[model samples]
Target: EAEAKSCKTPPDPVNGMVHVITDIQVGSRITYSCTTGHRLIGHSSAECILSGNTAHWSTKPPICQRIPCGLPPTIANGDFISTNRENFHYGSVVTYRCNLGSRGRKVFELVGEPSIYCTSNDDQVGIWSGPAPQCI
Candidate 1:
């Protein structure tokens, strides 16, 4: 068997939230993960390779990026209580209110829920749950 060598630090900056596991032998793997809210964007683990006596990562280290919530879908007759945050992050929330008489609009009741909460979508982008209500 060839001698072992440790994997070197990455050339580029890494996300702070990303985890770096240690195993410097042949067939070793380094797992990656985020602290919270954010999620890993690439492979959860990078494998180590033995090229003669040289060792290096099989793939580039994965990174942890903030899960983007983008913007909530707008309601036809409703307004949001949350306006301070220009961009919604994971765990961000927005309260909904249907327009009753502000713009001389007809009185209408909102259907379903009344608010939305942001969440990391299983290694995907951020998403919110129901009350995707409609005015009726």
Candidate 2:
């Protein structure tokens, strides 16, 4: 005998504002938002259907705000743990150290690798001779 549905109204940003609902039962639940600055880009809320009928909205809608961060890689002497900080997203990792000899040699053996590219038989010696230093 379970029967009592009424809940389904969501989708009004500029069109006609469609929102219809009569009753609704079951573990009912629904929600939605996107008007302020406009952001809800996917799913916002949904739930309903204990036996009254059905109601569920959330295939995609939840996006609003800003996201930008990536640009901080310029070392020569080594110095950059934090620069005013912005957002920098996307596997970020920076760390360098070199100043004293500047590449004259004996700088921790050039410390790790930093070859910029230059070894086709010297290629007129366009850099990378032995120390290969230049970070700034």
Candidate 3:
């Protein structure tokens, strides 16, 4: 049997959103809290070494909702510009406009899952959100 050491404080510059450990082993547990007013999103508090080197958090990341703009408004004729080919994530900003209209070239900005723009140019459009946006 091996002695257990306190899980190393996740790498410096702790992400207000996520905590990462370097040398966590099996059966190691860790507890964390979100800043005031900010609630944890997914697995915020989690045990280390749950599945090999990777670990899960109690809450995901605290997404600052309640934006004055509210959920991004739906666009008329535009597709999300991404690198992969998916929608945007929370805090993701996407520019939208009609595919081939010079007169009504209104550029709309959208963020998060529901606000993603839909377009006919599936092949040309790309995903610009970080970590491949996945709707929950």
Q: Candidate 1 residues 1-136, lDDT tens each?
A: 4556767654333553334456645577766655567665566667778677677877766676777776676688877787525766667778777887876467876777777877755656566675477888
Best by lDDT: 1
Local distance difference test, each candidate: 0.67, 0.39, 0.38
- TM-score between model 1 and native: 0.63
Error of 3 at 93 (Å): 27
Stretches of candidate 3 exceeding 4 Å from the true structure: 1-23, 50-136
lDDT of 2 by residue, 1-136 (tens): 4654534445464322222242223354545565432335455555544432354442333444322224444345643343324454322333344555654554442244342222223222222223333444
Among these predicted structures, which one has the highest TM-score?
1
Poorest stretch of ten by lDDT in candidate 2 = 117-126
Per model, how many backbone clashes are there? 0, 19, 15
Better of 2 and 3 by lDDT: 2
Model 1 CA deviation exceeding 4 Å by range: 1-3, 8-22, 35-39, 52-54, 83-85, 103-106, 109-112, 120-126, 134-136
For each candidate in turn, give its C-alpha RMSD to the true structure in angstroms: 4.5, 15.4, 13.2
